[PDB]
Symmetry: D2
Subunit: 290 residues, 4 copies
């Protein structure tokens, strides 16, 4: 299965108490497929509040996602964790469920050296019959890998690509050039245009859950070299993203989904419950960009 394309980092629906709302999650999934029209879903990423969940909850979410989606769009399961044993168990679980590929965030919290990071990745991919995408998000994990390091990880053919969520376009350009046979996904929605001209094979974002169409326009207009048109879309998109970040990223994307009849619900505590100011602000944003 060719993985190129646009992927929504799947949001998960929780009730006020933090319980997973399967009905809501299924709606979010449906919205992404029928309304946002994304090529696939990225399940278990930062966007899905993955790290605030128990392993059994992670498995439930992977199950629901695969069940609702079936074979319509593609699926990438993020199974990274500070607990390698958990990451290995989740790789087998999602590989069995039929996920088209798996992804793993660089191990964090503790300060592992590269040798250890490599051991981590190889142990994950070498345990299942699947393909792995390296999840690199430096501003959260604090881990920054060089070009040669990525080269070492790529030694393994089962490691097919990387999700580049860093503002280093010099490194991105070097990656594109040094690894022509590897997939590179843009991780910053507000920087989709400059990333696409550097040759990314797709994008994985949290805002795609509601701004999927514009996202595809930017990506497509650019690939067709209608830059001035692409920049204009990126402009509106960034006006949208700016209000979202200003009003609380996750709460707001969910409130924007609610406005569309999707029961995206709450975020897991300690992520604040949306205030009245936030809800009213989220309503305005919907009126202005949708």
């Amino acid at each position: 299965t060719d993985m190129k394309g646009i992927y929504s980092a799947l949001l998960v629906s929780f009730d006020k108490e933090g319980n997973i709302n399967e009905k809501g999650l299924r709606q979010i999934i449906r919205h992404n497929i029928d309304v946002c029209k994304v090529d696939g879903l990225y399940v278990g990423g930062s966007t899905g509040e993955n790290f605030m969940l128990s392993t059994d909850e992670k498995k439930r979410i992977f199950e629901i996602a695969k069940d609702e989606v079936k074979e319509e769009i593609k699926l990438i399961a993020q199974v990274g964790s500070v607990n390698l044993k958990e990451a290995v168990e989740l790789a087998k679980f999602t590989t069995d469920l039929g996920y088209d590929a798996i992804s793993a965030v660089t191990p964090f919290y503790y300060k592992f050296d590269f040798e250890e990071i490599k051991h981590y990745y190889n142990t994950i991919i070498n345990s299942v019959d699947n393909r792995l995408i390296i999840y690199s998000i430096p501003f959260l994990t604090g881990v920054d890998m060089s070009l040669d390091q990525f080269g070492e990880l790529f030694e393994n053919e089962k490691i097919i690509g990387v999700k580049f969520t860093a503002a280093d376009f010099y490194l991105l350009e070097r990656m594109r050039k040094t690894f022509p046979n590897k997939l590179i996904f843009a991780g910053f929605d507000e920087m989709m245009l400059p990333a696409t001209v550097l040759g990314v094979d797709g994008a994985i974002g949290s805002t795609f859950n509601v701004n999927g169409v514009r996202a595809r326009q930017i990506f497509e207009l650019t690939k067709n070299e209608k830059i001035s048109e692409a920049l204009e879309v990126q402009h509106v998109t960034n006006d949208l993203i700016t209000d979202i970040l200003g009003n609380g990223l996750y709460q707001t994307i969910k409130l924007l989904l609610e406005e569309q009849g999707v029961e995206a619900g709450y975020c897991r505590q300690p992520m604040k419950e949306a205030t009245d100011e936030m809800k009213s602000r989220a309503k305005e944003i919907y009126r202005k960009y949708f």
Copy 2:
């Protein structure tokens, strides 16, 4: 239970497969009590490789520690996690086990604002009938709180203190003065002398698992104002820590324990296995300091 004193951030023993060696763990605990003469154990912290473990593993460790220690020394359980639900679960579990106090690291990975950090802490301590200590350590989490932010936290009389794992002696001095009714624990073993003269109520450290005696000498001598003597101990203590750091912190402390018949074992992967060089080196360190 007055919580002042010297606490070892309990190391855990793992077999070659990475699974908990209970016999080894009990020996580590016994070594701390009978040989290092520590006043208590800080269970579930970074030193215990806590964040690389599953919830069941954390629980088993909490039980083993309580069962082996019983009432001999004080016990603080670090139940912090990015998963607040798990944090509350472990808070109750350990409280039901008779732990003298609980501790929680600042929620990491995602970027939480103070309001949220304060909610996280209130939720934990308000769910059980115990006392909580704030685990700050910003060099791993990246979360730096101000004096007033600590004040807001200390607005809950069930939050009795803080484990200061920072090198800001200005903030340290401010807190000792601003909260004379709260406990303050030094977190940097190599800076024990300079922190004690500022009036901390004790220390929580990783190297205490083997260097507990010298740690007590630094702590006591300093409290008795025999600074010139406390410094000489700190000097030897720092020579030891410098060598342990250069050879691999966790792997070396365990190898130093193995040298004494304590089955400390391996470290949880992806933390590397000790090499022949490291093992030979650990032996040299043992002969030079023990």
Copy 3:
């Protein structure tokens, strides 16, 4: 005078003792004008080793560049300094010499708040009959200004633009959209392509002293929306920049110039003298890209 275009951050030639080599400076100037065909020169920047010089040395460089250029291409004078009085003295000197515009890096070393930085820029621009361009460069000064702060600075119509030397393409995109009437120059040579698709009005770089042709191509090709070709030139350019960076930026560009008969000379101590290895490598680089 319309300031859009490709500007080389002028390098200065020094002999082994640190003396300004005038003959060599004029050759560097001629090379940029006659061979690299740049649209202008950015004098007194980091690349010109400006902050390692005395005020009168800076003055000599400004007069030399002015004289040698005649009226062939445009000229921008970097007059910023920790000493506001020197900045004002230099702004008047260069304005009187006929420089098309002045530039000023944010005051560094001491930690100034925005109010003070605003007073800094206003004091400079209000002292002369000229136009100013903000020199940001966050990695050497550690100063990060928000979009709103830039908004204030731009209140002054004499502050016509900013040299963007940061990797924040989100801020870049917002800058373009929010200030359509202000000039925005890219300061990162290895990211010219992604910066151009975002609407920058030109670029100011150190590598243009030798790669001005390819740099212009990347700019024009992108403007004409011929992305594929633009990316190819960026790739070869970044191959060059990577090698240069690995060998020693300033010393290597100067050695690349020496290979062409331009006596670019040494760098000012404490910047090291090129070693035999660096010189050998420099030759290889010249052969490979020129």
Copy 4:
């Protein structure tokens, strides 16, 4: 001359326009010697707004300080600069004036490697018949040197010590132990107590310009190992420093001197002029501590 002791980072008096107020400068000096009872003056440091001045102004201040002090107390001259040539010039100038020792901040702004920093320091001290004190302060420079690098620097017998202005007490302890023959000066006034128990040979501070008496008390009490008393004075001193920082470090110190008939004057622009609020707040602080 033995350079141990309490040194005040000498403040400079400026008039509203920014001109050196020679009269007020002599009063600041007399105050430090007669009222603050310091052992010496550290001239031309950050506190002296040294980096916002021209070489001629720096020399003038050096002349005034030497003329006013005569041979009463010791004098250290900070001659560091991004311009190696200027530093050498100032090193000769101050040596000729009979300064007891010189000091040099690490070369900043540009990213010099260690080899180059070593060259910089050797060039300065090998140029005069004097002794040199390394000035670290990574808070404003961003230059972090290791124990081994300080080792190479100390290879030169003429490099007699280092002014430590970082919060790394680990490095401080290692330094004291590793270089028993070298001088170590504490640079953080609000951390004098914890630093002195580690064996620093003295201190250099900005707040000594008005708090020299208390500063001496902390230093001497700690040296006598009367910690409890030392901590009490550090507590009051830190209340003072906290108010000062809150109201504007440099402005407030000068205003506190004004209340005492010392024409400390203004700060050099772009450092903001004291507001009315600031001025009244300064009077309060004065009443509250003097």
